[PDB]
Structures are given as C-alpha cells and as structure tokens.
C-alpha cells in the first residue's frame, strides 16, 4: 500500500498518520482518520515500551582489579565483559532491524485495510483510478463523504445515477 | 467529477532507520533505543556521595600517609574515586598483602 | 551535587533506555553496553513526499 499502489504521502495531511483527501462542489481538503491513527500510536507505543521495560538490570559493578600475578583471571574477566558485549550488540542490532520491518509492514496493513473498507462499501458507484483514489460516478456531498469515512455508507441510492455515468 | 482518496502522512523528517530487508529508510517519526549522552560529572549513586581521594590512593588513605592528611572520610559512600594523580600510597617501600581484596571490600561502606 | 542510578568513569548516565555506548565499566542499575553508533527504532511510516 505505502509506495505500493498509493504512490506517495501527503505533506498536506497534517493531523494524522492515515486519512482521506476529498473533492466535491462544497470544497476539497485533507482529513486525518483519527481512530486508526490513535490505534497505530497505541500499538507502536506498546512495542517501544515492551523493548524498553523488559530490560530489568541487576545492580552491578563491572570494574575489577587484579595484580601482576593475576593475569589469567583478569583475562577471564575480560572474556566475560567481551562476551556480554558481543551478545548484546548483536541482539540489540537485529531486534531493531526486525522490529522496524514489522512497524513499516504494520503501517502498510493499516493503509491497505483503509482502502479496502472504502472499496468494500462503494463497489459500482466509483471507479478505481488506482493511486488510492475513487472517482465517483455521482454527486457525493460532504455528508456522503463523511458517511464513507465513519463506515455508514448507503450504496443503492446512487447506483442508478452511477449506471448512466 | 467528485473524488475521494486514501493516503498517509509525510513531512520533512530526514531520520533514517535500518530494517532487515532495507538500509537507510527515511521515516516520519522514530525513537533512539541507544543512550549516547552523559552529563560529564561524577554524581551521587543511590543518593549517597562517593569517596574521592584525589592525589591519594586507597593504600595512602587507609594507612594515613602524611600527604593524605587534608582528607575527610564520611560515614558512608556508594563508590571510591581515585584520579590519574592518585600516586600517594605506601611512602615507605614494601608489600601491601591482599591490597586489591581490601580495596574491593572498602569499595562501598 | 548531581544524583544518578548509573555511574561511568567519564560521567553519569540517566535513562530509561536499555542500551548505552558511553563506557563498558559501569556501577549501578545500568543499561547494557553495546558497540552500536545508533539503534533507532521506527515509529512513524515511510517518508515519501
């Protein structure tokens, strides 16, 4: 969905992550879908918090001191520190790589499931131009436009007007 | 003539993230999981101030080296600080038996 | 006269975040030391104007 069929994003849409751009006789403009944006934030905040909060660290002093005749256990201490370093650098790095993929995939799902709710309500009354848009074969006023947005659209009363167009 | 479009947010954010399949992906919003900043100060740990020794080390402090006279130990400390100039230790040559072990046990009192 | 939960030879760190790259030798309830220069986690979406 993101860079898939919908080519780009809107700098004009200011107040949300996902939304709609309409155009009729009454006017035009960007409108952010608040409900889906709010959920997206609520789920990703949970993701960010889960990676952060699940790290419960013990009180530890990493520093140790060994004399000139204690080099073996000094190197054992270094092996313990370098061992934890490698484990943590590797796991932290991959976790970031894997979670960023999932986050960008999550955003793709939300944009797709929003297109496939508008398409799912309209059918014959509007043609899919592609690029995320629906060119209405009829007069769709601000109430008609808002009826699609909240998911309470009435299909049959425009189909006859759409049939002739 | 009438149209409705489905889209997503864009801004002038230049923040790049790395995914498993793709490097340098520019995103609208992000968080840094890595802490790369410090205040550059030796602070009180657990609310308790550290024991700073300055020109003296633990050997010089605990034995009472003449150069460690102007030094006052508190009732408690969370950790001990020595400097790169902590050269004042045993002014009369010899071995401090189990020096490191004493240092470890004195670290927090 | 500052207060801290994690102390480092070059200065105290106060977080929050699970990972740090300041110094391996730390005293206290400290974030785990890593060799990473960045660990940026995407929250928003792919930015394409």
């Amino acid at each position, epitope marked *: 969905a993101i860079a898939g069929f919908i080519e780009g994003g809107w700098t004009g849409m*200011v*107040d949300g*992550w996902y939304g709609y751009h309409h155009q009729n006789e009454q006017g*035009s*403009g960007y409108a952010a879908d608040l409900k889906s*944006t*709010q959920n997206a934030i*609520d789920k990703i*905040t949970n993701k960010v918090n889960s990676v952060i909060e699940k790290m419960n660290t013990q009180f530890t002093a990493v520093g140790k001191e060994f004399n000139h005749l204690e080099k073996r256990i000094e190197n054992l201490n270094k092996k313990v520190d370098d061992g934890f370093l490698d484990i943590w650098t590797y796991n932290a790095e991959l976790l970031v790589l894997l979670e960023n993929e999932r986050t960008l995939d999550y955003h793709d799902s939300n944009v797709k499931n929003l297109y496939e709710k508008v398409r799912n309500q309209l059918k014959n009354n509007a043609k899919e131009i592609g690029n995320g848009c629906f060119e209405f074969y009829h007069k769709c006023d601000n109430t008609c436009m808002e009826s699609v947005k909240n998911g309470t659209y009435d299909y049959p009363k425009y189909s006859e007007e759409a049939k002739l167009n | 003539s009438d149209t409705l479009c489905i889209g997503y947010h864009a801004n002038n954010s230049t923040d790049t993230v790395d995914t498993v399949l793709e490097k340098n992906v520019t995103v609208t*919003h992000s968080v840094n999981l890595l802490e790369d900043k410090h205040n550059g100060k030796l602070c009180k740990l657990r609310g308790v101030a550290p024991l700073h020794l300055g020109k003296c080390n633990i050997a010089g402090w605990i034995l009472g080296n003449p150069e460690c006279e102007s030094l006052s130990t508190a009732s408690s400390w969370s950790y001990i600080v020595e400097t790169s100039s902590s050269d004042n230790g045993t002014c009369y040559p010899g071995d401090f038996i189990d020096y490191e072990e004493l240092r470890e046990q004195l670290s927090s009192v | 006269d500052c207060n801290t939960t994690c102390q480092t030879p070059k200065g105290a760190i106060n977080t929050s975040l699970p990972f740090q790259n300041i110094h391996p030798i730390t005293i206290g309830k400290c974030p785990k030391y890593v060799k990473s220069t960045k660990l940026r986690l995407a929250t928003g979406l792919r930015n394409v104007p």
Partner: antibody, heavy 120, light 108 residues
Framework: QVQLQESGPGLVKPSETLSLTCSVS????????WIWIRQPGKGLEWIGR???????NYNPSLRSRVTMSVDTSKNQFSLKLTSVTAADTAVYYC???????????????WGQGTLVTVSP | DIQMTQSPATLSASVGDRVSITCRAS??????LAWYQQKPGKAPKLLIY???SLESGVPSRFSGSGSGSEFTLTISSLQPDDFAIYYC?????????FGQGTKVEIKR
C-alpha cells in the same frame, strides 16, 4: 519557536459580532491547523480548529455563532463570534496545533491572550 | 463531549513537598491527556503530553501517570515558582475539553 499575536476590539456591545486576529510570525499560516481557546472566572474552553486545506471543526455549544478564516497574504488567522452576550466576556487565545507525532497533536505555541468585554 | 473532573480545586503545600493533582475522564480516553501550567496573566505552558511524556525544557520534578479515566500529575519537590493554576486536557475526540483547574499556592 514561533510568535502568535492576538488583536481585537477589547470592547464589543451585546448582540454584535466579535472579530479577532492572530498575527503569526516564524511559520506559514497555510501549513498548520490553528485553534482558538477562550477562558471566562471559569476554566478553559476550546472554541475550534481551522485549516487552509481544509474542513474546519467547531465546538457544538458554539457552532451556530463561530466562523474562522485564514488570510494568506498578511499571514493572519481570524475568529468571528456572532450575536455575543455577557457569557462571551473572556480572554481569547490563538494557538498552533503541531503536526502529528508520536504524541501526537498538541498545542505547544500559544499567543499572549487578548481580553474582550461585552458591555453597552 | 467528555467531562474532565479535576481534584483538588485549591492546594497549599511547602517547598520540598510532594503534590498530586488527579484528573478524571467521563469515558476511556486511552493516553490522550495533557497537563498545562498557567502562570498569572499568561498563556498555559505545556508540561506533559500523552499522559506521561515530559515536554522538552520542563523540570523532571513534574511527572504524569495514568491511562483510560484516572490520571495523575505529580510535583515531587515543590518550588516557589510552581505557583500556578494547573489544567488537564483530553485530546481523544472533539471537542477538546479541559479540566476546571487546580490552583497551587506555596506555603512558607
């Protein structure tokens, strides 16, 4: 950091139309949602939001009397409250609505507020 | 819309005291709650957005907690400059509604 400055009559007679103007310097008036907030005595009340492109939203308890506009040339943001009474005697604030973030949409930059009295 | 019920109405505490201001929503507002500080004859200053997240440049003594209905602003160690009226604001849905307010005066 952005400046917002409220300007108005200060005194307006009952049943008349109140006209206020938010002069913005530091950022473009066309790039942001802008909000009006008034406090009477009483606590804070949110009047509504307006954007150049587009579709404004106003408080249901005020919708019939409120109108907002944006002047792109003078970089200004306007409020028009019609048929005013003593209840409309308040300090009126113009504030910027920041773009969506992880927060996401919150008022950070405010004007310094303008007092408006409704009296003959 | 959503009614924001704030407690207490007035508050008087000394320097160093812990101050707690409680806000309640009439319905579940997730974490879409903001805290403002209003100094006399001035515009409200944002302290906490998203129920707990601290605004840049605001002292760490200010903290937020809560989700759903019950929310809490906490000043851990009160300061002479903390004299102001404090407001909670929901931004879950329109219209945005503020709490009635909590006036905090400094005891000396």
């Amino acid at each position: 950091q952005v400046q917002l400055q409220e300007s108005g009559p200060g005194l307006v007679k009952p049943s008349e139309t109140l006209s206020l103007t938010c002069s913005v310097s530091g950022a473009s008036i066309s790039s942001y949602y802008w909000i009006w907030i008034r406090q009477p005595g009483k606590g804070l009340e949110w009047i509504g939001r307006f954007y150049t492109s587009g579709s404004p939203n106003y408080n249901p308890s005020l919708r019939s009397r409120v109108t907002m506009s944006v002047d792109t040339s003078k970089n200004q943001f306007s409020l028009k409250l019609t048929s005013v009474t003593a209840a409309d005697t308040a300090v009126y604030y113009c504030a910027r609505e920041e773009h969506i973030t992880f927060g996401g949409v919150i008022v950070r930059y405010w004007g310094q507020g303008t007092l408006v009295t409704v009296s003959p | 819309d959503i009614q924001m019920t704030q407690s207490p109405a007035t508050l008087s505490a000394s320097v160093g005291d812990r101050v707690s201001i409680t806000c309640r929503a009439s319905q579940s507002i997730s974490s879409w709650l903001a805290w403002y500080q209003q100094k006399p004859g001035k515009a409200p200053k944002l302290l906490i957005y998203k129920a707990s997240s601290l605004e840049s440049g605001v002292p760490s003594r200010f903290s937020g907690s809560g989700s759903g209905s019950e929310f809490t602003l906490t000043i851990s160690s009160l300061q002479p400059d903390d004299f102001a009226i404090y407001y909670c604001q929901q931004y879950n849905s329109y219209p945005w509604t503020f709490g009635q307010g909590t006036k905090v005066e400094i005891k000396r």
